[PDB]
Design a protein around this ligand. Structure first.
Ligand SMILES: *Cc1c(COP(=O)(O)O)cnc(C)c1O
Ligand SMILES: *Cc1c(COP(=O)(O)O)cnc(C)c1O
Lengths: 791, 802
């Protein structure tokens, strides 16, 4: 690892403020300082020699519609080992590095766990030495920036300075032309009606202390003729920009509303644009390496993260057949050995499908290709289930004027994997059982993971230092070493040091909470954290009901003091989720100001949850809330972050809680509530939440407080949408049915927290036993089972 | 006169250049310099030079001299990379270094689209002036707009002018620097409260995008600060999620439209409103930036005029005057008298206009709606000026109607400039006299020290040393003293007109320039032009009064003469045009159509062959001018007498050795005086003769019936000869010449023009007498250096006592 060169950094920093047009470094604003330091570091990085790839290893092309990368400058310094050198150089300018890093708005490039998984996997590939390129979209405004207006969620664009972001590099020789719409001539020539330019905007992915730097390649859409001077000179200044906007709209927003025809068409264009550019770029790299097209699968593999990039399959077929004149069988022999598909889905109804009419109109050549895939696949299905029209309707790639993208992924690729042992079994038994009959060796598991660089070393540096002194071998790229901590759970000095670190993290969070909300929270209390997206089945309103129960007990009658912290976004137009957010904020207003409670209870809903906020919340967690309805979580990478940093999990037996309980032991986790099978049986027998209300005085009471205006200044319909989902709507995620199990589990939490030694033992054991959650281990599993396997 | 400019050439450093180049292709994400495309090579070389420039020591401003803020709505700067290398003295060093990469520097420079930041001579004057201020050590900032698409990019489709956006990679242009600390907030519309607080309806951010203006071998680098408009909240997520993707961008597009296009069509109300917003945005940003510099230098607001002067190039930035009053009054609580005491000693105004009817005016209804607080300030200017007019012409209502700043619901911007400033100047001796006599005689009575002349000029760096390096090195070898920042040295060339070896070298250079233009013409049009022919060049904007169609009728006459007599003794000719017609200018576009159709016929007629070709080079620009001007034998300067104040193109062509065929008006007057009547071809009706002819009732139909040659060439345009039978092809041009009354006297000057062009043949036949005349045009035109212009501005206005 090349060491920090202070004189080179100084010369690079000087070039930055000279380029701004300033006379000295001291003239910079705090924003300019962050841009200049980041740009200087980018210059030094770009001068570093490129560590060459491992011979005889396939290069991985990882395609994802989100990359939730978080801030990059601090992460890059940690991976290079330059943090201390830069920190000290900046003290010479009276600049505080840690404060400067807070100038960076998180690049708004992803939404949730799907995009954070892609980011952790890029980081791990760079660290374990898997040559790879990430392929995404360079979104200008992300999903949205969340704020609270009288407790209601408000949505604005999440701008992040995309065009001026200092870590970008743009090689214009990688621009790609993408066609849209039009017709296919009688002789098979696609004549698009609209053409878009894709520019590659590259961010660096740095490996840990190994001089590896690989690209996250983010495509940005533009038009070659965006502006119509005739319309401008006629006075129509807005419509003059129309052609440009029709291209640039592809990379404005992540997951824009698709409940209408314009938005459905937009989503499909985004996916195709991403895949046409990516496919062109992969073939260009292969060609410039002097490699033959027929051997593409020997040198390259393409990982499809969910079904969003499915269209890459017929796009690659299109290029091979139409632009390189390969036979169908020769083209398919390549694509069918190049594409692998990662499934994140639990129910068949959630698999992605497109109206054939929209695909035909938008991508007429691809629709012909897709129908030929479909027609050729029918021969095999009829061989195996002769005359069975029902099996064909299920397995078809096109049927009833519908294109089944997940089906096309299974039929068109050599591997399918789920993201946890139980999920990957369900992929085979529930989603694709017939396909598994045809192609048993196609299906695999790779359990998800998280990078220990960002999520321990960077956000929890004091815990990281403890691990450095205690463990014999390096652990930051060898997380299985954490198991050697088990012994120190019995050492009273270790315990005291470890618990002190957790308390110092809770104090640090207290500051951050007081800056954003002004609320003062009690660091002696239990920090009880739920950081899931806001969806009904995540049951933030189950959390709410328990909080109301705690609030009620304090108002009347020795519970441990608590601080409930929430971070969650709701999709725009998801009115029920937004009403749950409204209730939580309204109830927190009462609790935080009510003098009857004081320092016994506070609720903090931090707005605009993002990677940067998670780095501050997660090291401070005592309790990790993982209370989704059993059956509805395949994984849970947040769960893994929280456990490794020494929070204890309260949760249902599903998703990543299964893995955590398996590793840490029943003494060290709080599993509760209906199992997957018990949820199904309760609905099968007839579940009425109203009957459960009638027999539960505490439950009826907290729900009365939400119906009678106690938290809305006398509006009885403030929380109307939440309450109807729980009562006449039928409570389909079983908030009431799990209520008393949850309340009872949380009482066990109190008891452990009073036994300070036993609590700390449990926390240490969560850190020590969860080394398997490293995304380095995930990547090695992908390498052995899929990417580097023999075809 | 002996000028002593402090020379300071930091020498080229090949190692530093190599390291900067390496950072550029590393920043592109490449593995070696050799991977670069041609376009990347230009970006990398230009960006490396920008890094080295930014690392040079910054020249400090001259002690005790006012700083000049030069505000213009256009800056026609041309390509920067080659000019910057020449001013730095690094051209040969970079050329040699690039040979080590097998890169040819002169080829690489051609990758650059001219920054589309100006239109014609008004903007090129502003660019020559900025270059000269840097070279003479006048501390200065130019203030303009960072137009994304310029005026338009010109092409020809079946001979007709087509107009497209003139995109030039604005946001990625490698010489730009942007200091976000200079961003300015600009308000639009709204209302003024009863307490006098302006509450705007729309707010726009102005970003300063700076280009460097480099002096000649003196390490001076000064900013051309170009404002670009943006909105702080350009994008509406609710509308995007509703599927209204274009309307989602409305707020941003409504701000950005201010710096999209230069001189957008204002034939309609939306365009008029846009132009006024463009002008206000430029002036609000510039005024804020000037005050910021003054305040950061620790200087007192009351002393602004002792340290700063603001030059208004034409009336487009007039609104800067009430804008500075607004800031002084509303934001610094100055009384009107104390504010006016500052502004009236800070602003100076350069007039380019000839007719009172052409002076810029705005509807009061529109100024009130867009700038309600400024309208109040402007009325106060008006009301206070009336008290002065009352004292001098009491109760005279016609005088007041003439001099008022606001009258009959119109705001007179030129009047506001005179009333509100301390100096007014015209751009040539005779023009500046007419400004006082015809335009502003009453103002000159009130303020007899306010009016001046400063004759225009051009920079010798771009317009001789860069575009004509062979002539430059002849001047170097011959004069043995530096002439590029001391152009009056050219007068020492006079005697070399009698040195046959010099004449031969000077002639070899003209001919080599013609060969180089022939290559470029072949590359751009496919036409092979004859380098032994007279290269006859007209490079004016396309306007009826520039009379490109007088040139056309003469071409037709020459074509007829040598078609009907293959034994004709006329000298071979190549007629070259560069000209854009403003969008929507239908007559000018029909003149273009006629020229291109006649050229098509001539160029493909084997009867004439290499005796005659006509080349209309599309998309005339600075870079095209640098190829055409050094190759010119004849400089066409044939506007109707009375319609030209100046003619900077005229000066460039004369210095590079072309002889002028022109009317006695504009810059031709001063050229003819300097070079002598024997060395120029003045023709046609005088200014006075034009006026008298029209008053006697001029009827072009009568002239046509008495002139059989004129009748014959016009018939060729009427009967489908050049039109594949379409007799209506040139209806608009023919009508303007005939039933329309020929207002610019094309027919009246035709035979005088034909006769002058025959004298051109006769001189060109004796290459000694021709070369002698050309040498003496180069030798005697040193006064047309923009360095001399700047010295005059300094002595008379910028550094004068108030
Ligand atoms: C890790 C992470 C996630 C995923 O966490 P889950 O509990 O699986 O939803 C989402 N957002 C951010 C910012 C994260 O860091
Ligand atoms: C010098 C110049 C002008 C001004 O020339 P005129 O003959 O006065 O119109 C206009 N355009 C360009 C490109 C020039 O170089």
């Amino acid at each position: 690892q090349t060491t920090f060169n202070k004189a080179q950094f100084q010369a690079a920093l000087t070039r930055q403020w000279q380029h701004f047009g300033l006379q000295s470094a001291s003239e910079m604003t705090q924003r300019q300082w962050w841009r200049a330091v980041s740009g200087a570091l980018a210059e030094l990085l770009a001068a570093q020699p490129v560590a060459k790839p491992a011979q005889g290893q396939r290069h991985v092309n990882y395609i994802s519609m989100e990359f939730l990368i978080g801030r990059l400058t601090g992460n890059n310094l940690l991976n290079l080992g330059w943090y201390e050198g830069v920190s000290d150089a900046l003290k010479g300018y009276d600049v505080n590095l840690t404060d400067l890093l807070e100038e960076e708005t998180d690049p708004a490039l992803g939404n949730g766990g799907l995009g954070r998984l892609a980011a952790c996997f890029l980081d791990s590939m760079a660290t374990v030495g898997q040559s790879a390129t990430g392929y995404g979209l360079n979104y200008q405004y992300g999903l949205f920036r969340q704020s609270f207006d009288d407790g209601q969620q408000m949505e604005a664009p999440d701008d992040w300075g995309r065009s001026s972001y200092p870590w970008f590099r743009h090689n214009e020789a990688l621009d790609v032309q993408v066609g849209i719409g039009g017709k296919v001539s009688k002789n098979g020539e696609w004549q698009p009606a609209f053409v878009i330019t894709g520019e590659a905007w590259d961010l660096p992915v740095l490996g840990y202390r190994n001089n590896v730097a690989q690209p996250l390649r983010l495509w940005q859409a533009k038009h070659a003729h965006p502006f119509n001077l005739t319309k401008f000179n006629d006075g129509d200044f807005l419509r003059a920009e129309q052609q440009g906007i029709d291209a640039e709209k592809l990379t404005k927003v992540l997951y824009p509303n698709d409940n209408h025809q314009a938005g459905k068409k937009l989503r499909l264009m985004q996916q195709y644009f991403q895949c046409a550019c990516s496919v062109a770029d992969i073939l260009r790299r292969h060609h410039l390496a002097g490699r033959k097209l027929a051997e593409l699968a020997d040198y390259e593999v393409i990982q499809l993260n969910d079904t969003h990039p499915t269209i890459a399959i017929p796009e690659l077929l299109r290029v091979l057949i139409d632009e390189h004149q390969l036979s169908w069988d020769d083209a398919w022999a390549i694509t069918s050995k190049t594409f692998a598909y990662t499934n994140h889905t639990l129910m068949p109804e959630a698999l992605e499908c497109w109206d054939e009419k929209l695909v035909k109109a938008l991508l007429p050549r691809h629709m012909q290709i897709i129908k030929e895939i479909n027609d050729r696949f029918k021969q095999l299905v009829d061989k195996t289930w002769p005359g069975d029209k029902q099996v064909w309707a299920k397995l078809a790639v096109v049927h009833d004027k519908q294109v089944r993208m997940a089906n096309m992924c299974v039929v068109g690729g050599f591997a399918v994997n789920g993201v946890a042992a139980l999920h990957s079994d369900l992929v085979v038994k529930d989603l694709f059982p017939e396909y598994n009959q045809l192609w048993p060796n196609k299906f695999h598991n790779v359990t998800n993971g998280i990078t220990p660089r960002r999520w321990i070393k960077q956000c929890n540096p004091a815990l990281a230092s403890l691990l450095d002194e205690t463990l014999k071998k390096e652990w930051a790229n060898d997380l299985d070493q954490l198991i050697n901590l088990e012994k120190y759970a019995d050492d009273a000095a270790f315990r005291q040091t470890y618990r002190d670190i957790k308390q110092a993290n809770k104090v640090h969070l207290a500051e951050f909470v007081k800056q954003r909300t002004g609320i003062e929270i009690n660091p002696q209390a239990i920090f009880d954290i739920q950081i899931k997206r806001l969806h009904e089945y995540k049951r933030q309103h189950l959390n709410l009901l328990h909080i109301l129960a705690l609030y009620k007990e304090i108002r009347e009658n020795d519970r441990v003091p608590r601080v409930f912290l929430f971070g969650a976004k709701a999709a725009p137009g998801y009115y029920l989720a937004k009403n749950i957010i409204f209730a939580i904020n309204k109830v927190a207003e009462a609790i935080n100001n009510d003098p009857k409670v004081g320092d016994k209870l506070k609720v903090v809903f931090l707005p605009d949850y993002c990677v940067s906020a998670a780095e501050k919340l997660i090291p401070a967690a005592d309790i990790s809330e993982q209370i989704s309805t059993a059956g509805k979580e395949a994984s849970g990478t947040g769960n893994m972050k929280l456990a490794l940093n020494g929070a204890l999990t309260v949760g249902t037996l599903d998703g990543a809680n299964v893995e955590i309980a398996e590793q840490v032991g029943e003494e060290n986790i709080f599993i509760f509530g209906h199992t997957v099978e018990e949820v199904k049986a309760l609905k099968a027998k007839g579940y009425d939440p109203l009957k459960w209300r009638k027999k539960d005085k505490l439950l009826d009471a907290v729900l009365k407080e939400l119906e009678n205006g106690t938290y809305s200044n006398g509006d009885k319909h403030a929380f109307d949408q939440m309450l109807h989902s729980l009562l006449q709507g039928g409570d389909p995620y079983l908030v009431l049915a799990d209520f008393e199990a949850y309340v009872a589990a949380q009482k066990r939490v109190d008891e452990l927290y009073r036994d300070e030694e036993a609590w700390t033992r449990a926390a240490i054991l969560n850190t020590a036993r969860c080394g398997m959650f490293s995304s380095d281990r995930s990547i090695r599993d992908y390498q052995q089972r899929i990417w580097q396997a023999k075809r």
